[PDB]
Amino acid sequence: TLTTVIDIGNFSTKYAYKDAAQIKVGSFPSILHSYKPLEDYEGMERVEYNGLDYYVGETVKNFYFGREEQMYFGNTRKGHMEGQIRLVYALYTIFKETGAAEFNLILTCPYESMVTDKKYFVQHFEGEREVIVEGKSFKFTVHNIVMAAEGLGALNFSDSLNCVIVDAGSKTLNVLYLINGSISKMDSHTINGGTIDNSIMDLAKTFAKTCSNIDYDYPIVCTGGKAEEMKECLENVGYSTVSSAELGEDKPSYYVNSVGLLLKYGR
């Protein structure tokens, strides 16, 4: 039984798991399109789960040639009748690396939609499910789902236990105000707009307007894919003790929300 953490995003979908003492990690881009029976596709794979028939892979962006603003799920309630495909293809990708068919899912979600997502993640996933990927059917088992918060993976790489975790996402910012290893509910934002639509210098300045109950000596931990460019544009705003979370060797900044939850949670 393999306990893994799958950070379903909008630009990409990051999965992390621990087989040996090392952490094996990977991702795949979060662009999927309806079926449209094609002649001979190469860099995409057909996924069928629960009455759906979608292409997930690298070359699904070829379906959106002159309409490239339509290839990204925008700030929309992860785990729809379209967002399940990103999760069950992430389960298949782990199976192509290990051979495990019994999963303990550590899902990530924004903190505002914490108790809301249990309609869609829990009921559709009760063990002994089955996908049909590239014709070949695949059966897996998920018998417990631990729905974490999107941002807490950067807390392991925080020098202070009392900080603000800024998730410089792709369609949304997840400001997560944290006290003692615990998340304050009143002071945690979810700012719309991400690094795809907006520049970081125009996105770090909207952080300084929303979370303006923060003096400039307060610790800020930047995470997300644009983390090391986020802290270079917050220091020009005037914050001082900001530090982006850096992972180990050969793991870039967009695995921080996923790798750090593996190093902390899932007991």
What is the b/e burial string over 94-126, where b = at least 16 CB atoms within 10 angstroms of the residue's CB? Answer: bbeeeebbebbbbbbbbbeeeeebeebbeebbe
- Contact mark string toward its own copies, 15..34, x via CB under 8 A: -------------------x
Assign residue 85 a region: left if phi > 0, alpha if psi is -120 to 50, beta otherwise? alpha
Place of tokens 């979908």: 13
Residue 89 interacts with ligand ADP (CB under 6 A)?
no
* Cα distance between residue 182 and residue 187, in whole Å: 12
Spatial strand order of the sheet with 2-8 comes to 24-29, 12-17, 2-8, 102-109, 136-149, 129-133, 44-48, 54-57, 32-34
Place of tokens 């690094």: 195
Selected binder of Mg ion within 4, 5, 6, 9 (CB under 5 A): 9
Selected binder of ligand ADP within 154, 226, 247, 260 (CB under 6 A): 226
* Cα distance between residue 43 and residue 183, in whole Å: 41
In the complex with its own copies, which residue's Cβ is closer, 101 or 196? Answer: 196
Interface of this chain with ligand ADP, residues 228 to 257, rule: CB under 6 A: 254
- Contact mark string toward its own copies, 206..235, x via CB under 8 A: x-xxxxxxxx-xxx----------------
Q: Is 14 annotated as a binding residue?
A: yes
Distances 255 to 33, 74, 103, 224 between C-alpha atoms, Å = 25, 20, 20, 8
Q: Is 225 annotated as a binding residue?
A: yes
Residue 135 interacts with its own copies (CB under 8 A)?
no
Residue 153 interacts with ligand ADP (CB under 6 A)?
no
Interface of this chain with its own copies, residues 77 to 116, rule: CB under 8 A: 77, 82
Q: Let me know: does 27 contact 56? Beta carbons within 8 Å.
A: no
Q: Under the rule (CB under 6 A), what is the footprint of ligand ADP?
A: 9-12, 27, 169-170, 195, 224-226, 254
Binding residues: 7, 10-11, 14, 150, 170, 225, 254
Q: Under the rule (CB under 8 A), what is the footprint of its own copies?
A: 34, 36-43, 59, 62-63, 65-67, 69-77, 82, 160-162, 171, 179-187, 191-193, 197, 202, 205-206, 208-215, 217-219, 237-238
